[PDB]
Design a protein around this ligand. Structure first.
Ligand SMILES: Nc1ncnc2c1ncn2[C@@H]1O[C@H](COP(=O)(O)OC(=O)[C@@H](N)Cc2c[nH]c3ccccc23)[C@@H](O)[C@H]1O
Ligand SMILES: COc1ccc2nc[nH]c2c1
Lengths: 324, 329
């Protein structure tokens, strides 16, 4: 099976765009690939965090990924800081990364971590002999650096690393509720644009009801991204939840207004979210289960990570560690 | 418990008399008075590109040389940096509490700057992690590491202010003489352990006969008559020789100045060559005994890494608890 590596930020509150797009897709491909999910708490501290919130957010992220359907028996899920090999390889790879490359990544009051984290990101991927990396547009420059580091290192010492590839195929279109041209992003400043995975029925209704549509006369529920971005976004969201086709939904809403569309979308999204929240709260409230998931995952990751690091360390020419 | 001493040296190039006077000499003398931990910093060495076989050999060379200088494994903890994962772990964490401007302003980074890698830029942060891991009180180094040591104090204070008494704020221990030994043919420049011109340097593993010839050819000055007195502006070479003689013998500069009244640079150089040649002969005798005893070197690295890991993990656990990571179970 090809190895897939995904970094999960313990800070990003996931939206329905994250779930119905990328996540639900990957939950269904756990028997096709050897998937690795890394909760990146060492990346998170590049921005200053409240200590207690970061600890909570780490566990919130673990429970939500399990709630979405990540299976710790099939996939490997773990906390980044629990595996020392990431930092160990991170430093080694600093020495085979040009300063110019990090300065070219798109002044003196910035912390060194925020400047230097793309090297740790490269080490995260290269530790596990990774074949595929699903990235957004924003993470593409980081993957190229990881690929350039791997090729540069292999040219000097032989075939130590796999040169990773991006996962090209896309999933599910979910746009922002008040700016349907812009995609629904977890990083969005305005939260009225997004529907979080842990939102209750009343909060979704309020946000869906206020979603921008259009001033067509008569009002007509038809798919058209150019001219009816808002109405089209609501149909896409409804299609993603229920599995019904857009033309099937256009037939369903024939002679119906936007208020009735918005009601069916709110009803459907909350039906999906309520099952996901049952799972979330059940996993999140069981500390013994979360501890056992983290131990097994870190144990799995560390076994594989140490094999690569030992080869990296042997190649560079360090004296081998004495054990007992 | 005793206050803690930590220091380290790179296994790259070949250690000089400069490295001995500014650091190793103080390391040997501190062993009973304080709890001493000394480290071979192979992770710092790879910031400059090494041959793989040369790096492995240089690590074991450096270990043997510590032992030959008088670093006793029964008194001090001696280990290889890469054998303790906690150095890289804390190093990353301290990156997030170090400003970019602090690293870009570094003298040592600018001088070292074809292969300008991120490790060379990020060098002082890992050095801070080396020191702060062991609750270090004193750091015996040469003058050229003063700026690096300032940053690890700043980092320690900055972190402690936010999270409490996690680190000790370390203090430099720079010697009165031999803190900055200068090049023999270029006494305005520091003696390096990777100088292209080898005649600038007195290697610790260099043939004493060859070392005596380098001292004889060391540049002095055009003063008429020749006078042996300390003056780094106008008499850099003579001052460097007086400084070397002071540090080997333990005698002060004014003591030596009186001793050389009415004498010239032939007497000065004869004394320096004699004192240094005798020290390196004895040092190299002990060296080959330790260096060829692989089982002894294997046991020192094992015991040292074990002692280091126990202490380093105590500090890292508290750092990780403070910053808000979920603890490893
Ligand atoms: N010409 C000279 N005259 C007098 N002293 C000198 C001369 N050249 C070097 N030194 C001193 O020798 C020690 C080793 O330096 P390295 O370059 O091996 O290695 C270095 O420059 C350190 N960054 C290694 C290190 C890494 N982590 C640490 C933590 C604590 C202390 C030291 C370290 C140093 O103390 C240095 O000040
Ligand atoms: C890029 O990752 C790393 C890893 C360990 C480190 N220690 C100091 N800087 C570091 C950077």
């Amino acid at each position: 099976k090809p190895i897939v590596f995904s970094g999960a930020q313990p800070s990003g509150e996931l939206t329905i765009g994250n779930y119905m797009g990328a996540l639900r897709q990957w939950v269904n491909m756990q028997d096709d690939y050897h998937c690795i999910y890394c909760i990146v708490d060492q990346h998170a501290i590049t921005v200053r965090q409240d200590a207690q919130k970061l600890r909570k957010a780490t566990l919130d992220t673990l429970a939500l990924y399990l709630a979405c359907g990540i299976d710790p028996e099939k996939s490997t899920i773990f906390v980044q800081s629990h595996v020392p090999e990431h930092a160990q390889l991170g430093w080694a790879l600093n020495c085979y990364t040009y300063f110019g490359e990090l300065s070219r990544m798109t002044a003196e009051n910035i912390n060194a971590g925020l400047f230097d984290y793309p090297v740790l990101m490269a080490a995260d991927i290269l530790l596990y002999q990774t074949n595929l990396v699903p990235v957004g547009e924003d993470q593409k420059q980081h993957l190229e650096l990881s690929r350039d580091i791997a090729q540069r290192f292999n040219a000097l010492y032989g075939e130590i690393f796999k040169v990773p590839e991006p996962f090209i195929p896309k999933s599910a279109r979910v746009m922002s509720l008040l700016e349907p041209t812009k995609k629904m992003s977890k990083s969005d400043d305005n939260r009225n644009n997004v529907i979080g995975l842990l939102e209750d029925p009343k909060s979704v209704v309020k946000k869906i009801k206020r979603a921008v549509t259009d001033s067509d006369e008569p009002p007509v529920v038809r798919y058209d991204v150019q001219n009816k971005a808002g109405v089209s976004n609501l149909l896409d969201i409804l299609s993603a939840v229920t599995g019904q086709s857009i033309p099937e939904l256009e037939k369903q809403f024939e002679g119906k207004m936007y208020g009735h569309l918005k009601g069916e979308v709110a009803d459907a999204v909350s039906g999906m979210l309520t099952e996901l929240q049952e799972r979330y709260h059940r996993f999140r409230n069981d500390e013994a289960f979360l501890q056992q998931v983290m131990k097994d995952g870190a144990e799995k990751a560390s076994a594989h990570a140490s094999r690569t690091l030992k080869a990296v360390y042997e190649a560079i020419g360090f004296v081998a560690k004495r054990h007992h």
